Design a protein around this nucleic acid. Structure first.
Lengths: 208, 150, 99, 138, 124
RNA sequence: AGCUAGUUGGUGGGGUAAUGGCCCACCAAGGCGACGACGGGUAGCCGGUCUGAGAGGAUGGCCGGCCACAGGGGCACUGA
RNA sequence: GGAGGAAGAAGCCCUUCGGGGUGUAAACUCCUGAACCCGGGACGAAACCCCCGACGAGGGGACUGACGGUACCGGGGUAAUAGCGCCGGCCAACUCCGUGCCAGCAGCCGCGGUAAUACGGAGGGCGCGAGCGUUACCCGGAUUCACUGGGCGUAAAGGGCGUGUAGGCGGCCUGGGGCGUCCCAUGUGAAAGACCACGGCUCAACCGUGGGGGAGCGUGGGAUACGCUCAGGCUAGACG
RNA sequence: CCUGGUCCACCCGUGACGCUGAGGCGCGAAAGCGUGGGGAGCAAACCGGAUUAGAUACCCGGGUAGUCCACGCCCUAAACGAUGCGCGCUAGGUCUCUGGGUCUCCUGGGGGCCGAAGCUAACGCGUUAAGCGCGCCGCCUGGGGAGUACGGCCGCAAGGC
RNA sequence: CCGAGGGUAGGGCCCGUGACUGGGGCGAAGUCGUAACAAGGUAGCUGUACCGGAAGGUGCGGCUGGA
RNA sequence: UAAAAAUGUUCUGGAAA
C-alpha cells in the first residue's frame, strides 16, 4: 500500500531531486542536498551506460514515485490514458493530475503529496458539496475542492493555508483562500506541469 | 554537429602463431533529430579509437529524410543481405515502434511516429544498413510528381 | 424460395428417378482460387421423360423417397454425353486407386 | 504459348525500364491498350502506340525515367519503380469498392477492371465500383 | 508451392509435444518414491545429485529430482511431483515439490524459502 | 480404399399431425466413393472467450440459444 | 499514517581505519483518526385487494422487507500488518564471509576443482505488494506450415527418365447469355458481450440507457471490363 | 535391313487442336536371381607368398561365381548440372558442332568458356539463369533414433516402395 | 411377428503383459584396433554383391563432393 | 582436358582464451 517508508531515499537514486516530504525536502537538505547519489553501499562509483531499458524504467519510476501511486494503479490509469483519443503524453500526465489528493496538494492545503492523501482519508477534504475520501477520486471540470468545517480551525490547516497569501495557483485552478475553495478550471498541460519527467520514455517502457 | 549514438561495439579476432589478436567494431549512428542521419562503421585496435572513427565516416554517409509531421511519407520494405526492414507511417502520438538498431537511426533522423518490423536476418549491421537504404529511398508527393510531369 | 439447381443427367437405371450432377464454383475460404466441385441429386421423374446427357433444372420438393428430395423442373438442353463421360471416366479411374 | 498476356506485358516493361531502354515492344491486345492508357495518363510511361512488328499487331510502350545523377553509378532514378501483377490466372482477385487497396499511401496506384471500364483506384472509388485487381504500380 | 497445390494439400499445423506427461497436464501429481538414490550428473559437471524414483497416480513410474540441500525421503515417502527437468540428470524430467506430504521443507533456509518449503523463521 | 439387402428406386398398402423404405409385401437392380465413401480416434455445436498489427491460432467454463441424457437398457400408457 | 527530526544515535555490514552505508529511516515533536463505541437507520413496495366511478378509463385507500438494526449518517475515537521474488548475461539490482567439480544452482548460454556479483548466509540493492513466486495449458514473439508472408545448385528440399488419365491453367477480333464478379435496394444478422457517448452506486470493479459496426446468406433491380458459356472470324502457339 | 528422335529451308495445309500432369502404363547403369547356353582375358569368395605387433588388407602367385548370349525377373545409384517441364522478357566477347544465306559476316538449332543488368550467405549463376515474369507437378520444415520398426502392396530371393 | 437382455460359436480393431531376443539413445577419466579428416599414409564417396572380431576389405559400375 | 608420387600405431576427464 502506497509505499510508506524512506522517500527522500528516492529524491536520491532517481538523482532528480524530489520533495515528497514538502517543507524539509524544500529546505537546505532535501537529503538530495548532501548526497546527489543513489543509496546502497556503492552508490558513488562509475555507472555502466544504463541500458535502453534502464532509462525507461528510471523515467517511469521517476514519475510513479512522484505521486505515490502504486504501480497497479499507475500502469492501469496508463492504459485508460491510451484508448482515450489523443496523445498519451498529455492525457496520462493529465489523468495523473486529476487525482483528488494530488489537486489537494496542487492547491496548497497540504505541504506535500503523501500528506494530501491522508487529508482525504480522514474527510478533511470536500468536493462540490458532499465530501470525499478516495485518493483516487478523479476531479472533473468546474468542480471546486473545499476543506471541511471541523478542520478549518486545526493548527495544521492554518499554517498550510497561510502559505497561499502571495503565491499563485496553477493556470487551471482558482482559490478562495479565506473560503478554501478553488475550482479545477481544466485539465493541466504538459508545459504547465514542469516535471523532471520525459513522458515519451515512460511511454516506451510499457511497449516492452 | 549532431547527436551521435552507437548501436553496437564488438570485438573480433584473427589468429596468429602466438594465438588470437583482437580488433574492434563501432557501428555509430549520428543525426540532428530534424532531417539528417548517417551511419558509419568503424574498426580499430582500441574501442575508443574505433568509435571515434565510426563517428567520422558517420558524417559522410548522410541522407535527407523527408520528415512529415514527425513521420515518413509512405511505407517501404527494403531488403539488404538476408536482412529485411519494414517502415510504415504512423499517426501523431504513436511514437517509434522499432527495435534498438532501427530506432536509434529513426530517432536521430527526427522521426517521432513510426511502425517498424525487422524480418529475415536480424543482424545489427545489416539491418542498420537496410534501414538507411530504406530512409534513403523515400519520396514525397512532391518529388513523385516532378517525376511524372508531362 | 425453393432452391433451384441446374445439372447434367448421369445414370437413370432407376424407375422414374434420375441422378443429376450439379456443379458449383466458389472462392477458397483461405486461398482465394476459384474452384469447382460437384454433387449428385436423385431428382424425381414421374413422367419418365428425361434421360442421359440432359441438362435439366432441378427444384426442391416434398420428400419423394429417402434421398429423393428434388423433382425435375425443366429440360434446359439435350445431348451432352460429353459432360457425362467426364463423370463416367472419373468413376472409372477409381478402379486403379485400390490396393 | 504465354499463359498471362498482361503479366507478360507488365514484366516486359519492368525488364526494359530497369536497363534504361528507350522503348519496349509488347504484343497487341485491346485490353492491354486500356492498361497502357492508364499507365500514360497517371504518367508512368511517356506513351504507347499501336505499331507493327514483322506483320503482327504490337504495342510500343515509351519509357520515362528521371534525370542523370551524381557520384558513382549515375544511372537515373526510375519513374516506374514497382509494378506487380496482383490477380493472375492461378488465383484471381476481386475487390469490393470498400475493399479497394490504397497504393503507397497515395503515391502509387492499383488498376481495377470493373463493369465500367479499366479504371484506377481513385476513379474506381469515386465511381463506387469494384472489380478484378489487375495490378498495382508505384 | 502453387496456390492450386495448397488448395489440394494445404498447410500443416505444428502440434506441440509435452515435456511432462503428468497426465491431464495436471499442474502436479502425487506419488511414492520406490527408490531414493543419488545419480552422478552429465558431463562438464560432477556431483552426487539426489533423485527419487516415484510411482504415480497417473499410472507412471518416473524419476524426479529432490531440490535443495539435505532431504528426508525414504523408499515409501509419498511425494508431490512438480515437473521441471534437470539438465544433467539424463533421466529426471520432474522436480519433487519441497514442503508437501512427506517432503520436508529445507531446514534453516533463509533465501527463496518459498521455493523450498522451509516456512519462515521468527526473528526471535 | 473400397462400402451397401431395406441396400438404391418403383407400385399398392400399414403408419403418422405430416413428408418419407419410417415399416411391409411385390417388382426393378440400384446407391455411394480420392470433390475421401466405409472404418478407427477424439468431441456436445453456437453467441462468444483468450491471443494477434492483421490474416490467423487456441478455446466453448460463467451468462444466453439449440441438442442430448436422467443408475445401465428396452417399451408404451395418459395427453395439446 | 502525515509533517517536522542529526554534516547523521545505537546495532548490523563494508573499509585504502580518515571513514562509508542501512538513513529522515528510527528515536523524538506535534498532527490526523482503519478499527472499535453511543444515537439515528434506508431505497428496493406498489398493485393484487378495497371504496367513489360500470368489476372499463381515471382518482383515492390499506396490507407487505428475507438481506438488517446491514448500507448509509450524526457524535465519540486508539499509531494502529508486511510480505514474496530477484540482483552473471539475456534483465532492473554488488560487496564480505562460507564452501572448494563438494554441498548446491540451472529457462537458454552455463556457474563450483582454495580470492565464486552464478552455490549458502549476511549487508546492501532492484521489482512488485496483500500479495508475491512456482507448475500445467493457449496465443505471441515463430515470415519457425509463410493467404497476408518462406523455400529446394552447396544449408532440410527436383520425382531416375518418359508417355499420359483425372485435375489446374489457356493466344487475337466480334457478338448473344450474365454463372463468377461488381453496384443499389431490401429481408435477415435475438439478447448479453465488445466498442463509443452519457449516467447510477462517495470512485472503481460491477451496472443502466442510448449510439454505431457486421460480413455472410435470401429477394428484387442493374452493370458487362476481366473470368466463364454458346457462336462466328483469325494465325503470331501447336500440328501437318 | 528394320526403326525412333531431331534440325534447317519454302511458308504450301489445319485453325488454339495448347502447357502441365495425382494416379496408370513403359523404359531404367552395375551388381544380383531363374532356366539353358557360353567361358579367352579379367575377377568378389576362396588358397598360397610376402608385409606387419597382428594383415581376414594394401603388394605378389593361383582362382569360382560373375563378367559374355538368349528369354524372364530385379527397379536401385554421387540414376548428378546434386539445378522439374513449358513460354515470354533482359548487353555483349569468344571458341566450337550441324543447317540455310544476297557464303567480310548474317541467320537457325546444339556444345563450351568469360562476363551487362540483376540475383546470391558467400562461392558463384548470368540468352544453355541460380536474372525479371505466368502456368502445372514433385519436394522441404532442427540433429539423432531412421529410410529403422509395425502395417500394406511388390519380389523366387536379395530386397524395393 | 418384432424385441432388451442372456447363451453357444467364430471373425475384426485396439490396449496390457511374456521366458528369451534385436537393434537404439544416453552415461568424466574401461578393452581392441586406426576406417575418416592433410595422395590421412591404399584419393574419398557411392548402389550392389561376397567376405571379415571391429572399424572395414575386395569385385562390378557410377560420382568428383580427388590429383 | 590426361594425372605420377608415401610399409610404420597411439596421446585419460574437465578448464585454457
Amino acid at each position: 500500500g502506497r509505499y510508506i517508508g524512506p522517500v527522500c531515499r528516492l529524491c536520491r537514486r532517481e538523482g532528480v531531486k524530489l520533495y515528497l516530504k514538502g517543507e524539509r525536502c524544500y529546505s537546505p537538505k532535501c537529503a538530495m542536498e548532501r548526497r546527489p547519489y543513489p543509496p546502497g553501499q556503492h552508490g558513488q562509483k562509475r555507472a555502466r551506460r544504463p541500458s535502453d531499458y534502464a532509462v525507461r524504467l528510471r523515467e517511469k519510476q521517476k514519475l510513479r514515485r512522484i505521486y505515490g501511486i502504486s504501480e497497479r494503479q499507475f500502469r492501469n490509469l496508463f492504459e485508460e490514458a491510451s484508448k482515450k483519443k489523443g496523445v498519451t503524453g498529455s492525457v496520462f500526465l493529465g489523468l495523473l493530475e486529476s487525482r483528488l489528493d494530488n489537486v489537494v496538494y496542487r492547491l496548497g492545503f497540504a505541504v506535500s503529496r503523501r500528506q494530501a492523501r491522508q487529508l482525504v482519508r480522514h474527510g478533511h477534504i470536500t468536493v462540490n458539496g458532499r465530501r470525499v475520501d478516495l485518493p483516487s477520486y478523479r476531479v472533473r471540470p468546474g468542480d471546486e475542492i473545499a476543506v471541511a468545517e471541523k478542520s478549518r480551525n486545526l493548527e495544521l490547516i492554518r499554517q498550510n493555508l497561510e502559505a497561499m497569501k502571495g503565491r499563485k495557483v496553477g493556470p487551471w485552478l482558482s482559490l478562495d483562500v479565506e473560503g478554501m475553495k478553488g475550482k479545477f478550471l481544466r485539465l493541466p498541460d504538459r508545459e504547465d506541469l514542469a516535471l523532471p519527467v520525459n513522458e515519451q520514455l515512460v511511454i516506451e517502457f510499457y511497449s516492452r | 554537429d549532431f547527436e551521435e549514438k552507437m548501436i553496437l561495439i564488438r570485438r573480433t579476432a584473427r589468429m596468429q602463431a602466438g594465438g588470437r589478436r583482437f580488433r574492434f567494431g563501432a557501428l555509430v549512428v549520428v543525426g540532428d533529430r530534424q532531417g539528417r542521419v548517417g551511419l558509419g562503421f568503424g574498426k580499430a585496435p582500441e574501442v575508443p579509437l574505433a568509435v571515434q572513427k565510426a563517428g567520422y565516416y558517420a558524417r559522410r554517409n548522410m541522407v535527407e529524410v523527408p520528415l512529415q509531421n514527425g513521420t515518413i511519407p509512405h511505407e517501404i520494405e527494403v531488403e539488404f543481405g538476408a536482412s529485411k526492414i519494414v517502415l510504415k507511417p504512423a499517426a501523431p502520438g504513436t511514437g517509434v515502434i522499432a527495435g534498438a538498431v532501427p530506432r536509434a537511426i529513426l530517432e536521430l533522423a527526427g522521426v517521432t511516429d513510426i511502425l517498424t518490423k525487422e524480418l529475415g536476418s536480424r543482424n545489427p549491421i545489416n539491418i542498420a544498413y537496410a534501414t538507411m537504404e530504406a530512409l534513403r529511398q523515400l519520396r514525397t508527393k512532391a518529388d513523385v510528381e516532378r517525376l511524372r510531369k508531362g | 424460395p425453393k432452391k433451384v439447381l441446374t445439372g447434367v443427367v448421369v445414370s437413370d437405371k432407376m424407375q422414374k428417378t434420375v441422378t443429376v450432377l450439379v456443379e458449383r464454383q466458389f472462392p477458397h475460404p483461405l486461398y482465394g482460387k476459384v474452384i469447382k466441385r460437384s454433387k449428385k441429386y436423385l431428382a424425381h421423374d414421374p413422367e419418365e421423360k428425361y434421360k442421359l446427357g440432359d441438362v435439366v433444372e432441378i427444384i426442391e420438393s416434398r420428400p419423394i423417397s429417402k434421398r429423393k428430395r428434388f423433382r425435375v423442373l425443366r429440360l434446359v438442353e439435350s445431348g451432352r454425353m460429353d459432360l457425362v463421360e467426364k463423370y463416367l471416366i472419373r468413376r472409372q479411374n477409381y478402379e486403379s486407386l485400390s490396393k | 504459348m504465354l499463359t498471362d498476356p498482361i503479366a507478360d506485358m507488365l514484366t516486359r516493361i519492368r525488364n526494359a525500364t530497369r536497363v534504361y531502354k528507350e522503348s519496349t515492344d509488347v504484343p497487341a491486345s485491346r485490353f492491354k491498350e486500356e492498361i497502357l492508357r492508364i499507365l500514360a495518363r497517371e504518367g508512368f510511361i511517356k506513351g504507347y502506340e499501336r505499331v507493327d512488328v514483322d506483320g503482327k499487331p504490337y504495342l510500343r510502350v515509351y519509357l520515362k525515367y528521371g534525370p542523370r545523377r551524381q557520384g558513382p553509378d549515375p544511372r537515373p532514378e526510375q519513374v516506374i519503380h514497382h509494378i506487380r501483377r496482383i490477380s493472375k490466372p492461378g488465383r484471381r482477385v476481386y475487390v469490393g469498392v470498400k475493399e479497394i487497396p490504397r497504393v503507397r499511401r497515395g503515391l502509387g496506384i492499383a488498376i481495377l477492371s470493373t463493369s465500367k471500364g479499366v479504371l484506377t483506384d481513385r476513379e474506381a472509388r469515386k465511381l463506387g465500383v469494384g472489380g478484378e485487381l489487375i495490378c498495382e504500380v508505384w | 508451392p502453387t496456390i492450386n497445390q495448397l488448395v489440394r494439400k494445404g498447410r500443416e499445423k505444428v502440434r506441440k509435444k509435452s515435456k511432462v506427461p503428468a497426465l491431464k497436464g495436471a499442474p502436479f501429481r502425487r506419488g511414492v518414491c520406490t527408490v531414493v538414490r543419488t545419480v552422478t550428473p552429465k558431463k562438464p559437471n560432477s556431483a552426487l545429485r539426489k533423485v527419487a524414483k516415484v510411482r504415480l497416480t497417473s499410472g507412471y513410474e518416473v524419476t524426479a529430482y529432490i531440490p535443495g540441500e539435505g532431504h528426508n525421503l525414504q523408499e515409501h515417502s509419498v511425494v508431490l511431483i512438480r515437473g521441471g527437468r534437470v539438465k544433467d540428470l539424463p533421466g529426471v524430467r520432474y522436480h519433487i515439490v519441497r514442503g508437501v506430504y512427506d517432503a520436508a521443507g529445507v531446514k534453516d533456509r533463509k533465501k527463496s524459502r518459498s521455493k523450498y518449503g522451509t516456512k519462515k523463521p521468527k526473528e526471535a
